[PDB]
Write a protein that binds this ligand. Sequence first.
Ligand SMILES: Nc1ncnc2c1ncn2[C@@H]1O[C@H](COP(=O)(O)OP(=O)(O)O)[C@@H](O)[C@H]1O
Ligand SMILES: Nc1ncnc2c1ncn2[C@@H]1O[C@H](COP(=O)(O)OP(=O)(O)O)[C@@H](O)[C@H]1O
Ligand SMILES: [K+]
Ligand SMILES: [K+]
Ligand SMILES: [K+]
Ligand SMILES: [Zn+2]
Ligand SMILES: [Zn+2]
Lengths: 422, 433
Amino acid sequence: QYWEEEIEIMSREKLQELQLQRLKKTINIAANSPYYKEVFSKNGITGDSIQSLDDIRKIPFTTKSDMRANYPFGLVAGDMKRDGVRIHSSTGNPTVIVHSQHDLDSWANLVARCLYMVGIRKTDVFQNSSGYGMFTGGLGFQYGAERLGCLTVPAAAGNSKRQIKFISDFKTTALHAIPSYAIRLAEVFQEEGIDPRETTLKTLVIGAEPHTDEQRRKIERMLNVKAYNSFGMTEMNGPGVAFECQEQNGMHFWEDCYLVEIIDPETGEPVPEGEIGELVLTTLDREMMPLIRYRTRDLTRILPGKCPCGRTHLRIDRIKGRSDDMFIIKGVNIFPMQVEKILVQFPELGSNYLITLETDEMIVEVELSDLSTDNYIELEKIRRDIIRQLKDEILVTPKVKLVKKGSLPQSEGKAVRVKDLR
Amino acid sequence: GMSTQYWEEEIEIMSREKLQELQLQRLKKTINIAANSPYYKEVFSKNGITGDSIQSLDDIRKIPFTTKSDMRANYPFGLVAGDMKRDGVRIHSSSGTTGNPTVIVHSQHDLDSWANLVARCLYMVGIRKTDVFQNSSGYGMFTGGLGFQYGAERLGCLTVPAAAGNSKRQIKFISDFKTTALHAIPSYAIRLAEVFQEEGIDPRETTLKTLVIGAEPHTDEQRRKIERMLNVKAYNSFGMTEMNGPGVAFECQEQNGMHFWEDCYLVEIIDPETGEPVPEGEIGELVLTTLDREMMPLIRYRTRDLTRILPGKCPCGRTHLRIDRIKGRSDDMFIIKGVNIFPMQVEKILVQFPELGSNYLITLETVNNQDEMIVEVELSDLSTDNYIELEKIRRDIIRQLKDEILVTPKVKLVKKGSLPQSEAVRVKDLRDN
Ligand SMILES: Nc1ncnc2c1ncn2[C@@H]1O[C@H](COP(=O)(O)OP(=O)(O)O)[C@@H](O)[C@H]1O
Ligand SMILES: Nc1ncnc2c1ncn2[C@@H]1O[C@H](COP(=O)(O)OP(=O)(O)O)[C@@H](O)[C@H]1O
Ligand SMILES: [K+]
Ligand SMILES: [K+]
Ligand SMILES: [K+]
Ligand SMILES: [Zn+2]
Ligand SMILES: [Zn+2]
């Protein structure tokens, strides 16, 4: 079942002419913003420059530095005073995105499309544990779930006792939470004397944080739910950008509203088909403030072949991480997902871990699991196996410490996996 | 007024005669809808309320009042009249886990009616689509959040969903986005004027032109202080979750009484003792009936709010009745930082800690134009806990109170017998009100 079958299963040929029509429209609109008027002027970008989807490569990339330099409204193309109805924001000077009613409705429709794809219906009780206000996850899932017709529960962030009360009393069936907060809720259910596997919950929507497939499976087993990967960023509206189908194998990118490129961070050229590179995105249905070839700093790849769900829209792999998550120790580049890929395979460990960098030495603290009935000798042998598998993957020997369950701190938002004290 | 502009002129200046037949039509419809809920089906059954009981607006007095106690007893969905699974799109819940909260269930119709009322309110005080509207109200379950958000987008304003706190970020949004309309509780509007001068900005030389202030009692003088500090026009905004949230009653540009939208609400002023209508223009309890709500309508709901109907025609030309300021309540509820709290919510948290005594005192004070809530509770001599352990318990008390009442109080562990007795435990409100 599809929210918009004509688009979701649209032929690649028809998708291409839709992308080209909307790419030309986006460029004509964006030409009215002070920023893209100047960019187009200096690079000879006119109304005749785009004749094919490949002609987008004539236009230079938009970086986060360019957006900071033109903060707050240098990239606003429309009439903000008359048609601008919302401002959202993403250390530093946060960037803002300005939306028109058109832009909000397009965003809401994409979120309803995503929720419907993973089996959520108007009969579902949808609870949003994302922060509201300026955070796109709040109003983003709120409008999308109301668009679909769910009985929504705008719980917002924190207060786990109240979250559990709403789930129990309102019979919540669909929940939006960051993966680490979903684990925290399952723990508070047990603390309050409720079996986290015997609630009314059926579907979880998890995003914002990089996480392994096994981290998601741990969440699924903990709460007896089906959990789906949700991709988004403020620059691209917020949620509803890319989402897993019921196949749970790659996130379908809505190519009617986004032009996806996977560029080599060194050369600035497209990577060979299916290789890892920087995700570079162009809005195709945004009017107040469109973004052209925006360098997301997110590393991923395009998963090949058509998906068994019948949707023609391309699938991206699990986000490897963001460029700013990468840390260097002893001249060697390491991503925290490399450390998680190893830790999740050990069932004696918990889901909370912390990487500390000191003067260079790398410390990997990871909480012990409650299920563990292991003694010192057997747990110390497991700790030795971890230092070893970490030395083989990250190519540096870290210090590994098995810590008490609950000893590591829990973040208000996205969990902080790296503490650089150098 | 000839130069006066209306969001919905046909409704806003509608004759009292035409308003009466609109209220009667919608009152009959509300009663027929509410009869489908388990709660009103029972109430109507015991009191012989049928489809022929309401022939005039005065016939509403045949129906008994709906109290908060009744609602908590029918928690969560005893008063839901519509098809919640198919048409229910939102739940607004009051605070707490120590008792049954209040739940208001809305359909898309109910949200659109509520958004239209908020747009009507904002337009009345001169806000247009050309304005930059910043909402400093909390979002999530708080109706001021999503209420003004939908209302301001309906009007077409460039909205800034700032949400509560972080005054330096509030001032940054006002300066960088050129905010012209701001929704804030009166004490927070003063705080932002103070933070503006702390950061070296003249609070009178910003892009701000209009302020919408509500959630708590404030005097006309406290509003004038706000207008002088920020060089703005500030307007009183009334609402309650039960009645949607914001958009229920609002001042016009005359700044003399809050216009109640009688097309969506039937207003009664009742004696808190007798339950009978008060003499025209006297102070009494505000008893309200929804007239445009379908998923969960409320009939003759005892709000516990005390006010009076201001007499005479308004020069703005609107025919909808005006209520005076809400100065207080007939119940034991208190409001601090615009958040509603019952003393029982505090007591039900404290009793869980065996290191504490039974004697406690809630003090409400104003410190540098900001409100503070102090919870003093006596130590039990039964505890064998040292300083470090007690202080850890005091932090756990603050934490559990914060989660419960949705405001962070100051908690002080006092000596056994230090707090005075007389008796229900009192709320010492030392604020200028
Ligand atoms: N499902 C996901 N998996 C991994 N990383 C994600 C996922 N969703 C979002 N992200 C990360 O979060 C970034 C977007 O964050 P941002 O828009 O600022 O905040 P928000 O979390 O409030 O949507 C992405 O660029 C990416 O790095
Ligand atoms: N403008 C106002 N003046 C005085 N009291 C007000 C005003 N607006 C709201 N209130 C009080 O707040 C109550 C409604 O509180 P509630 O909806 O629970 O919280 P909130 O609107 O602050 O989220 C009203 O019944 C009334 O007592
Ligand atoms: K529904
Ligand atoms: K606008
Ligand atoms: K209030
Ligand atoms: Zn698929
Ligand atoms: Zn008036």
